[PDB]
Symmetry: D2
Subunit: 478 residues, 4 copies
């Protein structure tokens, strides 16, 4: 029975009610019910947050004058603060999303805590180049901060996807306007308290909760935001990018979805393959940017693979989020709950042996078989617990079949063969290629999509590129 203390617009380290007066409700996907009502922001609110962020970015600001090292100190402060109150946040995260509490505690917030500390290390190590040119010339580059950055996040990993942006952005010295999902604003607002407590100057991070077409679009078009980062649907990603282009040509980072392939070679540890490929599709209830939507399996192990797959889905406990016995919780919205089983009869019309589940109970873990490429279950991403298992003959074959999507966020390969591992790794068009593991993410390893799965990267030194503008200084001597 947790009290929600932060419900307002966070601007200049002060709590605000919407200039409109409107508010909206977030509810608990597990136990249909509100938790509470949140200030509903809109264009004028973001106009205020932006101005706050520009003033904090002005030359001579307490933010801009700081030591590079103190900038990372502050980020270490925040990670400290997030470690204290870690349970508070993990709890809010589950009330907002129906995630298992243990999942929020040991995944979502470990991720936040490592990501914050990692980029704290980077703040005084952001370095440009001194460039050789002519004898009488001194030419060098500066990696300056971009300015006001906007973060727009989904509901599946609200706080994590938020600190994946904030951490690099702040370590590089930018200021920010954050807009959480409507469905899950709570952890984001809590972080604002922590951001004030740890001592970030007012205006460095402001937060405007609200809806997409209102607040998010107010950000994506704002003429004095210099960059956006967005994690969300592919289609909304296109709009955000079009918005940016029409307005002020702000720099855009995008992390979207994908038809993420999982390739099982005949020589694979099959018990590791089935277990990871199971955790790959069904983890966080199948709602995950990294979700495995296409399990390719070689003939030699196909049929037995299908069997092992099915026994694993059977045994998986599902129930109330607070449960120390849970893996899978509730999906967050029946908007797509219908789309899922709508797409489960998809693969009975075209022919697929459903050896498992096939309907709601939450929803029963479902497993398909004898799936082919043309079928829709192997065509459009599911956003839910369904395992479409396909058959392949050749290495070259599955390479073209995996790459035949317009996306390419992740890919996972299972084999003990050195040449099979490496040739597949080189050949798959995916931003991350895991080998004999799944959902192995590290603050120090970059993450992002090829093709229509996104632009740019989060998580690694490559993250810093999205949050810096390269300046060339060229000096001629007499």
């Amino acid at each position: 029975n947790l009290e929600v203390k932060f419900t307002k617009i966070f601007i200049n380290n002060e709590w605000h009610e919407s200039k409109s007066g409107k508010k909206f409700a977030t509810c608990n996907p597990s136990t249909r019910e509100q938790i509470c009502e949140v200030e509903e922001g809109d264009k004028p609110d973001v106009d205020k947050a932006v101005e706050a962020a520009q003033v904090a970015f002005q030359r001579g600001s307490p933010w801009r004058r700081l030591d590079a090292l103190s900038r990372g100190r502050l980020l270490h402060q925040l990670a400290d603060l997030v470690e204290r109150d870690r349970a508070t946040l993990a709890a809010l995260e589950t009330m907002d999303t129906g995630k298992p509490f243990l999942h929020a505690f040991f995944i979502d917030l470990e991720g936040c805590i490592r990501t914050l500390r990692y980029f704290a290390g980077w703040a005084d190590k952001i370095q440009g180049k001194t460039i050789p040119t002519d004898d009488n010339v001194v030419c060098f580059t500066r990696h300056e901060p971009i300015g006001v950055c906007g973060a727009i996040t989904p509901w599946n990993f609200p706080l994590l996807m938020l600190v994946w942006k904030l951490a690099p952005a702040l370590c590089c010295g930018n200021t920010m306007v954050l807009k959480p999902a409507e469905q899950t604003p709570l952890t984001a607002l809590y972080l604002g308290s922590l951001i004030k407590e740890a001592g970030f100057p007012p205006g460095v991070v402001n937060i405007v909760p609200g809806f997409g077409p209102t607040v998010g679009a107010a950000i994506s078009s704002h003429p004095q935001i210099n960059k956006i980062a967005f994690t969300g649907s592919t289609e909304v990603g296109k709009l955000v990018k079009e918005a940016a282009s029409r307005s002020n040509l702000k720099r855009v980072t995008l992390e979207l979805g994908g038809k993420n392939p999982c390739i099982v070679c005949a020589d694979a540890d099959l018990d590791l393959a089935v277990e990871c490929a199971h955790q790959g599709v069904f983890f966080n209830q199948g709602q995950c940017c990294t979700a495995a939507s296409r399990v390719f399996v070689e003939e030699q192990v196909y049929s037995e693979f299908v069997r092992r797959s099915v026994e694993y889905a059977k045994k998986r406990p599902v129930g109330d989020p607070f449960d120390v016995k849970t893996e899978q919780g509730p999906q967050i919205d029946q908007k797509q709950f219908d789309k899922i089983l709508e797409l489960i009869e998809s693969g009975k019309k075209e022919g697929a042996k459903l050896e498992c589940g096939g309907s709601a109970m939450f929803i029963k873990p479902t497993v398909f078989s004898e799936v082919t490429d043309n079928m829709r279950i192997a065509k459009e991403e599911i956003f839910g617990p369904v395992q479409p298992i396909l058959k392949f003959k050749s290495i070259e074959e599955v390479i073209k079949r995996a790459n035949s999507t317009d996306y390419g966020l992740t890919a996972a390969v299972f084999t003990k063969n050195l040449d099979k591992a490496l040739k597949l790794a080189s050949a798959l068009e995916s931003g991350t290629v895991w080998i004999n593991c799944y959902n192995a993410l590290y603050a120090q390893a970059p993450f992002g999509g090829f093709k229509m799965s996104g632009n740019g990267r989060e998580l690694g030194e490559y993250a810093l590129a999205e949050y810096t503008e390269v300046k060339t200084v060229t000096i001629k001597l007499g």
Copy 2:
């Protein structure tokens, strides 16, 4: 000079436009028609992208190549450009009004240097090996992006194409290039050389034609993975939106600017004047980096103004090929009147016209060099990109004043600062919001040094190791050991 090349370049073959239509390119000095080249359209673009896709398919000759052999191919191309250095330089002038010696020693030097710089980057495109857990091996590969599209302007037709082609090819991509309608000759000549140098067919394809027509088919193509566009801010906005609405292709942008040139009291005044001067009027004022806003400190304001006027008047104008010219015709009459329109806004808003102000010879597209006096921030000549021979000079009191006044624009491509004061030079360099900040020089570009815009002057960078990031896709391989 007779124009050998006038066709669509696909798979190292020359093709008549699928429509059969053709369009003409004209000479801004002779005001006459050089020739007719094939006018491409969406079907032609579709034909080139399929070539470039097939050229980038795994196993193709182009992908199985060594890293170093790619580098060697760029060197062989740069060799050839050096050979036919005078042909290209000629074609460029005919179609630009560029002084032939400017094309030979600036444009084409830059081309051969860029090609050679990035030739050496090929076998040094390196990713990372990243520490993680005891039992995990984690590294990144910098894969090529795929089919890249280049859309270039007329101000520096060949140079702006190379700037893209060199790093793109060095990273192992394939290309679909559209030169400007006004200036297609250099691009298609290069295509001859691209074949001769040994590049596999399909690696580089070229479809001349118009922006609404071929450019739009390239920006929206669902199978082009990356677009690089130099040109207007407006068409730049449109290009990024098409890229967005379609398949989210990565976008590089090099647009214009209202580039400040700030002269402090303690400047070499004669250097400031000379560099600021050719900074304005170089390449007939038609340049990305054109000096648009000469801020001068009050101490030296007036006799800076005087000293510039004399440079302007004595500056040779005439036939491009004549060895003594420094400024030639404007590109087309569409521009010629547009600048003259803005000159008249300078008078109409009240700037003392210290020089020029008119057109030179009624028949031609030339303009005599023009200078203005006590220009302020609000006037037209001080906020709109003129892109002609016009030197609008302003006055400032304090360095903090001029900082805020230079950064008050929506642009930020280049900036110059003249002073001898170490703290001033560096304080200014830190705080001016511009992609390149020259200091006691102007137009000092190197293939090693990145170039590109802050704010609405661009996205990304061309020319330096930073250019490889625009032509590669980061991939993370992460292996867990048993």
Copy 3:
């Protein structure tokens, strides 16, 4: 303050010297004995290296650690140093004669900052993935070197130990440290903190004792893989030779210098004087970076000379702990006479002694600040490293003159340049043969910025990403696919 720690630190345990011998450390101001600590010898060193080898064996707790957890351990250590910040600062002063506020705000700030800087480098020590052939996967790993040895001087006992310990530990090495005989207290205190912070036993071991005895056993040890030595040029020569004659251990060297401080005519003269002044006399003149040769342009020579004399005389000297002191005792009497000997060479070779020249109070080891006048290149005070409070000021005509005259030494650790002229500052910075070149500042060290010697002033660098190269071994993995 009572000294808690006086023993050999091996495997996180305290050990009496295998011989049983002990030696004493004395206070340069009180001229009294602080305490007795164990005098180590080869057997003790042999004991510590075996600990450090076992700590570095694959599978050991220390090697199975995460990269980030190593970083976290360095942060936990830096936390602890901040806690017992006044204890350490005290121990340092007692054993140094350092003004206690100098130790607190300079030494220990630098220590905590360095520890924290390199804590963040741990999970960002990255190798390369290298393009080669279509069928080959080629990458480099930056493995740790192994057991590293650190040998440090007395001028900055704790700081110079950390400078090595932070990057070495961050890269995952194990360590055998020998503090100077004169100044062992800070080092062994740290060892307490090293245990408390959670470092596995054996990762860091400390054997106090003498150079001919413990230092020599470390430099020659066949199982130490890397040696880092700050100290004299001569002992530096000997250390590298022992490293050579034995097992070719990698060698970092930070030695002394005859560091030029060049003041141009157009300098902030008051800044030049103040910074050049504390550049000489800081830390009682006993500093790697000590200003040894003040070149001044003739235009400002004489009343530069005057303006410095007044700073010298009004500079407080006295008890280290007294809050108003700036300069304390020299380290031992071995030095006290050595500087006084060279002062008398200044008179004997003819320099006008504008200030000081004597010793302050007969009982103590203090010296009043001393300044010389029309010093030339050939004199003793202008070619030998004084390492005390002595400001030898020279005169120069041209910048090219002073370039050749500053680079005429065998050293090149640091150099300062004061001017407001952009070209002068940069021309000088380019051409002075020194590891660090300050400009309108002095003693401006950052944990992010590399430090170390040109020529005979050192090998390698401490403090910046460049420091990781001294503590890692590059390995190339090259896989051919079938």
Copy 4:
């Protein structure tokens, strides 16, 4: 029947006879006989070369004022020149060394040509850092050239080991004093003609042929050489480093020998293993820094491995160097020819089944078996064609056995297992670890020894570190 045109000391692009007047003879290891007599340099000659090199390094020199890019132009010129006259050089190389002519042509000179072109690319891409520090400070690093560098080379790969130093050193803008081996000075002197022809300013590269204790020691102690690079014996490497330390503390790079292990896992392609492990020990007549001195093989394939090993040695053609039918030529000096078979009875006293060869004929390819760690054939490096084959049980086992040497230049592993490849790679203490190949060197991949096999690296961007001195510039503003 080739004429040797260059026999003198090369200083300031001019040909010189030794100030002493002494000369020495190089002879042809294949056909006992001189080729000719070479100017024999000594201390005063190097004193002249050094001064030449310092003057060419002075500020304002045509060398120092050059564009970074033109510096690489020149290196491209030299590689061009070496490609022309490639046959001339390959020929001199074989007259000097007894290498097969085809081996000199397609290995030694391809290596030289690629190495030169690779570092030509690097000259205008040597970049320092702009370092974040305080707001009012500008701090950046310059990677300046070190100055006069000395290269000292052996006889096994005279020209290649020489351009492995010259190429990085010149691209970074240093000047050089080269001392080839006494046994093989000829290609080095030829390169001097090419260095003049291609347009390098006088004094940038000078060459002083001569003996080790005379000329090499004159370099290693010279008070105005700022760095040495040395490839040669371990013991001479120690002396050079001691010399450097006693004199002026010049920067030293060392490439020495090694007891280079070759590890065959049970799952290995055995035909690739035996063939590479055969080419690994017997190539260039067993005289090679990369020579395989220790072949560890897992029980599961040991005995059959030994068999296959022996049949390969049988069939290998050996004869006159000029032969289009050759693999192996003559060893260059009977100084160690005796040491080899001296060490072949080594392993009969301690017990080793000699299934192959065992004596001179050149010398017969020899193969040992049932070798153990203690035996001297598995203890000291051979410098000749002998294959000591050992047996191992475990992965952990062979890891400690491989690493139990004081050296660590290279190591080669054969397995199709992904986990076995990677764990071995991480665990072996060697500067290069090849997997399913041998002697796979690339101008772009760094090369060098762990432990007593050397300091520093040649060949890769890491090469540039040895040829640059980091300068920190730190500027405080008012």
